[PDB]
Symmetry: C3
Subunit: 341 residues, 3 copies
């Protein structure tokens, strides 16, 4: 029975940015059309230049954020070009049936498939490849995961009948990676994903990542690729982790409104210091910036954040508020008449 | 001062099934009588036939689910037959005082003990052995843990004054296991729990399980022992983990109503993709099946799920709903006029 | 523009105790003055006498609990005596701007600094050192972390308009430690923090602690330093973990009211068995003791609790309530007419 709704083609953009969308809408349900192209390729994952045999949707880790509204249909064309070596598929945690779509989307290199799923559940959700068996974790931790956001048609709210609107949105995909080392402790390089598999599975089995990165590599979202904001802006930070827990924290800020389980039918928690993304999920936090300067956005296992790659920066423009915080006395020599024992 | 209430003897059944019970009841408080018999025995824990020196309540991992109502008394006869080698006891996280009952239930082989605890707290709760000191984790990770459910007398509700009723209930006990390996990486076998202890403690200390299983072994709840359901049924899935965190996910479904901390005085969260069972607790999720087919129920560390044992299946009978999901175009060769870069 | 409020100097006390404070107050906002003195020193961390090159605020792990009210200003003098070897600073997760204060408080040995932050966010919050880069995790896991509590001016409430008042408060700071071992597996000793660093970083990178302790050492809060309470007392247990997740559980009790994300703008959950402190946060639980005796307070990874150091005790005075729990029959030989198969 043909589905007779308007169609809208969406052009995806690379994370941490997000394709243009409306928050609140008075449009009715549409068939929202997306295309994802699998790309297997070697990628650089850390500041020392370590390479990795990655597998991606659309060439990025994470895959791009898709945004629709409650009641829309999502029609995804998944493409597996013949330059790839592996079969792939896609599982939407937002979707109902057939293992999230994985049981309807298995494609060999040289094939494509078209899946439609109804967006009946609001929130942010993981999507990931899941070919079967041990290939499921391997494809996911090789980079084959992203997220989809299903907004209420009226946009976000605080769970107490007040509208919430973001000025800016960023998507932070966190990736646990498992890179083999040689006898001397150096990371090993491989010429194909298949050649990396056996050694990689051994590292995976011990459940300790070698790297934990945002946007696919250590330092991806620092330096010149820091995330911009301004004092007074309400920023939505979507965070996903398809395989392993995370504990996001905005250093020098808070989560004003946090859906740590990621589902907008639940009221957000207020005023959090650190929240928790359970592996296999996406969550989201709103924050209104109150101070200018550099903020570091981390997982608050600080070892992961500082030493395995999992730090992003915000650079926030505006005027400093000395009522909220001030340096009363700059560093000075301890007074000779001090005690301090 | 004798307690003058009606007595009801309950016959426990092996997980993942649950003894017969009422959800809502107009019966008053009763003394609900249960018996648990400790059994130390070698068990098979994975598809390659690895054996393990297990210690169990009632011969199963997990121990059986006990179900009572708020205000009932629970009178447990704990039996430690003289064929066992170790002292054992029982700690109910549902109970108040004496380390959950552990300080009143320590029995040598050849002894039994009778503990009564009042079910003053609603929810699902862990029970476990806890003899003292380093024996506490060892007995728990050797299999000596289960769960108890204390239902409100009016049954479950959504926290907004609407009754919730399940058509079916399953109990998923997740077990982290720590099996020693020899110099070549093969799992070691032992002739007794005591002989396994020193080598097992060394693996335990590094906090990385070798196996993470549902119902005591990899593949326990797949193949012919898949969990049955039908389209339209509301299924309650109780999940426990006595020692280590888990992140349950129903692949192709959701948690319609989830008590991830497991306590029915709190309203459930709605529409979750993945939830979180903190180690040392039980949680519960309701889901109404909307699509037929195979569903995989996992912890969403996919390495744990696919490679360490932690996958169950549901086989759901009914009619496919093409409005919720459909394969618009089956796999086909990428059109020659396609781009895809 | 000078801030013209009354000033109040607070004398901090060593954990697990808490400086005197009011729960509800009709005082207006004050500038609450605190001093923290960094101390680098070797400390004993386990029952076998293992030593560790620690770095602390005020000589303790955790640093002391600071207590203020919503709307107060907190003026902290941070002192780094010239006997220390390292630069230090302080990041308050309760504060807004400048990386929580870290970007305004970096002091060399022989210096001090004065930071003021407005207590605009209610809850319990971590504070920690964060000098920069890989020094951030190293200083934190060397002991440089504590917590601050920002109470509502009306004190705590249940989120349903009922006041909650504690009779007693304890602060449990949990510390993950990473102690190097030699080729034979023995813990290594060092003459300075700098000399320990390279070997310690290698252990940190594998993300598995060697020790997980409360109040700075295994057994700190057992034996003669057990935590006292009485039947009928409502006890607030503040728990922090600056780097790694924890799952607190009171063995033989419950969490009557739990803010596991730690922020008093959110209603607490009721009747929990086990709760979850996400690494980089503090949470809090109220419990009214109903039974006398020993209680063990653990992280419910029981391996961590029994074998890596993470057990505290409460010793509770009062009268046993046989209605809540009783030993119906003491241990006895299994009756000859028993079956039990
Ligand atoms: Cu794939
Ligand atoms: Cu998934
Ligand atoms: Cu036992
Ligand atoms: Cu327990
Ligand atoms: Cu420091
Ligand atoms: Cu921090």
């Amino acid at each position: 029975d043909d589905l007779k709704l308007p169609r809208q083609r969406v052009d995806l953009v690379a994370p941490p940015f997000v394709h243009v969308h409306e928050q609140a809408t008075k449009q009715g349900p549409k068939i929202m059309e997306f295309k994802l192209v699998v790309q297997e390729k070697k990628m650089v994952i850390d500041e020392k230049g370590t390479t990795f045999q990655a597998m991606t949707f659309n060439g990025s880790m994470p895959g791009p954020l898709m945004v629709v509204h409650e009641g829309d249909y999502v029609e995804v064309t998944l493409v597996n070009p013949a330059t790839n070596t592996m079969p792939h598929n896609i599982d939407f945690h937002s979707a109902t049936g057939a293992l999230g779509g994985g049981a309807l989307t298995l494609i060999n290199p040289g094939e494509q498939v078209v899946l439609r799923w109804k967006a009946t559940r609001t929130g942010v959700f993981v999507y990931h490849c899941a070919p079967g068996g041990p290939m499921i974790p391997w494809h996911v931790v090789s980079g084959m995961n992203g997220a989809v956001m299903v907004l209420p048609r009226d946009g976000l709210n605080d769970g107490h009948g007040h509208s919430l609107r973001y000025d800016r949105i960023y998507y932070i995909g966190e990736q646990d990676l498992y890179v083999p080392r040689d006898e001397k402790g150096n990371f090993k390089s491989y010429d194909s994903p298949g050649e990396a598999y056996s050694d990689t599975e051994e590292v995976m089995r011990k459940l300790t990542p070698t790297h934990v990165v945002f946007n696919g590599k250590a330092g991806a979202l620092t330096g010149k690729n820091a995330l911009n904001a301004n004092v007074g802006e309400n920023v939505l930070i979507v965070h996903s982790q398809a395989n392993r827990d995370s504990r996001p924290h905005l250093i020098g800020g808070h989560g004003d409104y946090v859906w740590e389980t990621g589902k907008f039918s639940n009221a957000p928690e207020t005023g959090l210091e650190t929240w928790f993304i359970r592996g296999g999920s996406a969550g989201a936090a709103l924050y209104k910036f109150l101070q200018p300067g550099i903020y570091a956005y981390v997982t608050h296992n600080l070892i992961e954040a500082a030493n395995l790659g999992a730090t992003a920066h915000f650079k926030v423009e505006g005027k400093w508020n000395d009522d909220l915080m001030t340096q009363v006395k700059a560093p000075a020599d301890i007074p000779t008449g001090s005690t301090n024992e």
